[PDB]
Design a protein. Structure first.
Lengths: 265, 265, 265, 265, 265, 265, 270
């Protein structure tokens, strides 16, 4: 019975992985990444077949329901292996430009390939939070902003976060990053105007951190360089219709749940 | 004039640091600790005096009013310093076995010592949740459960949590730990009987986590070893008059506000 | 003007029964009991108002500033009488689980109550040593161990004794009973470990005596069955940090002041 | 017309038997016993109805006014007879724990009962000095010390004495027994300390005689074993506010009026 | 597949016990009791599960339709077992004062419970006549007077009977008990008025038997003390709209079916 | 009848293990230890008594005579066993800062203990050279300089050495270490002023080894790091009245007898 | 009137018994003995002596003096000294000289043989150079066929402008390091801080009442503590005490110390 294998750096954010092996194209999973937002080349997801078998084709469904932010990889391969060490490329893909949403990857093997594992592997870095719906073989109430990237980092390092959304608004929004360290008040960290042209920074981070967004892909990014331990905190991303009020706790009309960042000495 | 200095990994669960300077013995702070409940040795709390000065004595009140869980260090030292790099012991205390509650620590310096900083520093690890009431120099209630510890630790590491109480019941309670990731439901994790003799675990945490209690100190503990990303959640600790019903979301008659563990990758 | 009335078989261990009517909530009385530790059903404490009056309510404070062993009844009733032979319940209470200490009992009678006497009366046997603080109506610093239950019993009879502490230690003690007839040496009787899981009994009493502890309420007990007049003696309870040494006059670090037990024939 | 009947071995001390039949709950009779202080199985008190008649209830007040020493049986039965030789039981009782003072026993019978006789009969030996206030059917300042037990006894046998008190004290009192043969002195027999921990005896009695006290019930006892004809005398009980002075004649502050003991050859 | 189990001291009056397992709330079973009417602590009714299995919940429906006499325990507890020797409590219940008739007890084990046996068990003597309607698990007309109590007893013993009814009259009745030895004629034993204020007895049970009624519960009781062999008989309970004629064979308009009582030497 | 038993890492320097069993406080034994001078926690010395027996006390003399160097553990425990596998603590001693000399550990076991073994066991490490005098149950000459450490360690490691002395001079001595391989010359290793403020090391060793001394305790130590086979030799400690002549074969006025060090590959 | 009298003990006048009594010096028991303090300076000066008065002139085959005394404690013996005798008590001929420098504390036996007898009326030990120790002794014969203790010695009386050295010795020797300190308590007044020194001797402090006049020192090898007092003054009068603390900081407070001497009286006239 086929089980799911995938890059260890991903955490499940919504949904659960059983959804991926269930036959429904409308159940899915949304993944944050653990140490920095961008999916590296090398990263993979796909399935362990239990034992060597003779595949007549496959049907993997990547991305998920919703308008929302781009959710798939750009350049990837479909590869199968017998020893989980050595892999063999069946097909390269370029989905650069693809709209957000389910994409059905349905491949057909005229000549039944024989393999114990089969997966998709990223080929180039990809700054977007990945979602997926279904993975199988052929053997004949609202809106959420979501932050991602973020874990343990060494003093003086860099780490980068990303905010994505489940639906695409028809208006422009100012986006902002705040942080809260335990038992303290939520601080302002940075904001950016809807069109990207105006940005300001809290005093603590000026120089080190950089905010930015990509509207085509529908994500916002915070780059933290030269980190310190007093940077430890949960980081929230927030959406405000008014750039002037975007750097005030009582400004953002929409908040993410936050991603925890710790910097050790 | 004088300001408080204390350990950087503590944070305030209740009341606030001005209570510890207000001149009044019944205004306190109750601290929690980030990344492990236990208070390591080297941990400290005391005064930054402002400038080099002739001290005739100190009166520190440690522990805070109430007959709940144990709120004091066991073995600690009172030391002072001019530069805040080098410290000198005035005294050493062994308060092992002291009942919870205020402890007035009063000293005269027959010989006017001269310091800029003076504090209590911890000598052996303490698995309680520290409270405090006053810190001076001389110179010429409905029941609340509280989880502590919790922070971010990387996959495969360990973290331990504790749950204190603000009042001590004359009945005997089962205790449990639940967890709840955002959006998922609240899972049962581990329960323990009144007398610590019986315990049971949930399938996923079975054999990685251990639950214990120390009734004389009135704390419950949770040791998590071999941590996984799927362990990330808010951990709540709960009490229930019935060991059977304690593993059920509706068993407990009391709950903590929770603490956050995150496992990175 | 109104005066106190209570079960006869109690006697004052500490405080005075003036403190009961004195107006002050910090003055109380600590009570041992005579022929057996446990307060039985039927036992009472209350006022005789010295004539029939109209009552708007009562305020009885029970327990007494405590941070030690349970000092209250569990199930009692509040009742009044005209002639002292008929008693009519006004309210029944169930304080099972109550932390030790003051408990204010304040009642208002929308229509007045015509009463000559009014009291708390206990409904279920209780194994604790009772304390009390104040009894009004409305119209317009270091440790003690106390033993209780001592008195006089016919040969072949039974007696139960208990021992309470005034303060509750953060460390675990083994507890032991000893006895000492006048002019004789003090002879070990029984010992129980911290967690009550280990017990051993002096050669003289094996088979007739049981030692037990309830840690939640902070009491130790000695049940004496099949007594004979050789058992007559002052009975002491004591605590030793070490169980091994608990059965030797010099092990213990704190001693009770003992209750006399006398077996006639 | 109905007259009183009761155990022969008793005999009046205070008031007289006509107060027991006067309609008044506040007049009574206080009995001493002879040939032992304790009242035994079968001892009884009740009414000779004169002639055989029908009853709808009874009302017996037992004990006498005042919160002195305990004064009622513990376990007794209410029984009646036509012929006076054999008896049938109605209710049984357990007044163990009862306060001292009047206790009313109002019974009404669903079926009328006819009888020449009806009484209360003791079921279990009771070491107390018996009082009674009133006996009726239905047909539609200074304290005071008392010695009881003892009259005539064959040499080398045993006899038990008790001493009751009429008021009860806030304070603790050493209690002593003294005897006085006509013609001679008041010889000290035995004292006991307030708590009952300390006792001393006259050399004439040491090892044959035991003093003991029941501070609950409020009574002191002298158990006397293997008596000699020179033990003959008036035995008295006294109270001294100081145990040290309690074996001297001018020590006791309160003195009973003595009870005759006589040991024939 | 699951089998019923219940107290051995019960026998069925009406109903088939498979009714308790059909999954229908409107088909039930009325039980008589074997030795005396009153259900004692520890009695029980529940399921033999066949082998050890894992429950998610249970649904038990106690009492039976018809607003007759009360038909359920007051205090009782749901408990389970692995072996039939040992029982763990899931839930204690207080239904004091609940009205006659079915009552669905539904419970849900949020984590499964492993049991082979699960039942309800009485906690306090209950003087009714128990009826029950249905027992299940989850794992992924005319009026009848009924008599009960009564089996075999030693002479001189005691035994007590009850009469229940299946429907409640708005008219108020006199009740009476009658016995008949076989061949021998039906003999009057005792009667009671509707308000219980009036009673009379058959000549031979004079003094030894007591008739009584509880109208809130709708039961009548016969207490038999001091039994004789001659008391052997079937005892019938009867309703008569007129007390005067309740003692007469041709008086009572309603009759029970009888319960055998038997006295041996 | 009883045999001695001690840690294996030890060897007799003076006296023999008969003197510890001889019943003479004045005979005794002095021990060095292998592979490291210092005494590790869990090291022990005591008695095997063949059968298990009922002990009434013990009398152990630790240290032996002389006003030489410190000769006892600081923190240790008396413990017994029946199996030689698990051990129950009886007492625990803190002898920190006792004078050198013998010390009588006499314990009286008021309720007897049955053990097959009983020993003293070290708690914290102890940089001394242990001497001992007598071990009993109850049932009813110019100076010597001694070197300790010595053994066989492997390349790249670490080994420490102690020098102690049988008496203590009022003169203040420079101390030094010297080594020699068979066939070869005796070479200066390192030297320290009497007050320790002054060191100089040999050439083949500067940076690697450390010499230190504890005057209060009267010991000198040699800490060796990164040992080479070159380092194999007997090692000698020696005292010299002039720090300057102390690095010269001819200077020193008193010599050890060496302890054999052996590094291997 | 028939008598036989043994010889009798003689020693310098400055000394005074602290522990024991001198009967012990003559009782033929090595295990009894005497501890001496000195008045008017702690330190034994050259010329100080102890020995025997023989009663009349006599013929010695030898002597056996046991100096020091049963001690694991601080140093108890002179360093350089001579054995000498006299017939008149007015002049002395040296028999033997010793250099015991470096000796352990405790009893040292000095048994001496006299191949050809020496006849004398007095024979004794005499110090040869100043010794800052606190002298004990145990027996003196001829031949014819629980808890610890700190002790302050020195001073008594000395006038204005003067000088004085005090000393503290102990009956046993701890294996922990102690800070040591001096305190004075004038009559009726409170006990006052004086000076203190770290166990290792590298740190000291003096009360302002005395800084720059007094000096606190120690000899850890010998186990004694010294207090040099210069430029004195009548207001320096007090019983002086010495004390040990495990804490150099609490050392100067009237309650930090865990051991006190019974004190030595200093009195300064002008
Ligand atoms: C559940 N418990 C906390 C509790 C119990 N056992 C523990 N055991 C350990 N080891 N650690 C703990 N933190 C711990 N905590 C409680 C429960 C109630 C009250 C309390 O005040 N209870 C009720 C019941 C008493 C009443 O009737 O008033 C009350 O309101 O007083 C205090 C603590
Ligand atoms: C021994 N114990 C009494 C005690 C312990 N366990 C019990 N357990 C039961 N079941 N019943 C008891 N009566 C009982 N009593 C103690 C011991 C110390 C202190 C205490 O307050 N001691 C002071 C003195 C020293 C200190 O600070 O540690 C203290 O502060 O601890 C209180 C109670
Ligand atoms: C006699 N009574 C039984 C009855 C009455 N009082 C009691 N009182 C007590 N305490 N206990 C009882 N068991 C008890 N039982 C009755 C009488 C009639 C009906 C009844 O249902 N009768 C018919 C006919 C009478 C009518 O309804 O007009 C009907 O219509 O149902 C029920 C119960
Ligand atoms: C205070 N000290 C005296 C001491 C220490 N260092 C000194 N140093 C110098 N230079 N001069 C001194 N006079 C001096 N005196 C002490 C203190 C205690 C013990 C002693 O015997 N201590 C304890 C500790 C040993 C134990 O726990 O048994 C004991 O009871 O024996 C000895 C010397
Ligand atoms: C060299 N010294 C050993 C000594 C000195 N300081 C040390 N210091 C420390 N830290 N550690 C040591 N082991 C140590 N050992 C000695 C030397 C002689 C005597 C001694 O008994 N000397 C002779 C000879 C010198 C004399 O006493 O006149 C004697 O008479 O006893 C004692 C200890
Ligand atoms: Na799916
Ligand atoms: Na807004
Ligand atoms: Na405060
Ligand atoms: Na519950
Ligand atoms: Na009061
Ligand atoms: Na003791
Ligand atoms: Na009367
Ligand atoms: Na008197
Ligand atoms: Na049914
Ligand atoms: Na009729
Ligand atoms: Na020996
Ligand atoms: Na030399
Ligand atoms: Na001597
Ligand atoms: Na100290």
């Amino acid at each position: 019975n086929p089980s799911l294998i995938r890059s260890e750096s991903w955490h499940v954010y919504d949904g659960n992985e059983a959804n991926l092996l269930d036959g429904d194209d409308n159940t899915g999973v949304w993944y944050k990444r653990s140490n920095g937002e961008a999916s590296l080349a090398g990263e993979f997801i796909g399935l362990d077949l239990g034992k060597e078998i003779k595949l007549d084709g496959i049907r993997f469904v990547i991305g998920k329901n919703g308008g929302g932010s781009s959710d798939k990889w750009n350049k990837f391969k479909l590869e199968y292996s017998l020893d989980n060490e050595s892999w063999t490329t069946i097909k390269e893909y370029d989905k650069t430009g693809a709209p957000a949403g389910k994409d059905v990857i349905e491949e057909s093997f005229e000549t039944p390939i024989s393999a114990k594992y089969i997966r998709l592997t990223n080929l180039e870095p990809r700054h977007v939070q990945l979602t997926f719906s279904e993975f199988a073989i052929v053997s004949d109430s609202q809106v959420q902003l979501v932050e991602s990237g973020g874990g343990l980092v060494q003093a003086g390092g860099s780490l980068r976060l990303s905010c994505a959304a489940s639906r695409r608004s028809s208006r422009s929004w100012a986006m902002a990053w705040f942080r809260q360290a335990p038992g303290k008040e939520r601080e302002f960290v940075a904001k950016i105007s809807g069109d990207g042209r105006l940005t300001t920074y809290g005093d603590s981070v000026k120089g080190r951190f950089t905010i930015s967004r990509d509207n085509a892909e529908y994500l916002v990014y915070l780059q933290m360089d030269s980190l310190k331990p007093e940077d430890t905190a949960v980081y929230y991303c927030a959406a405000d219709d008014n750039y002037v009020t975007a750097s005030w706790r009582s400004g953002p009309d929409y908040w993410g749940q936050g991603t925890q960042v710790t910097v050790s000495s």
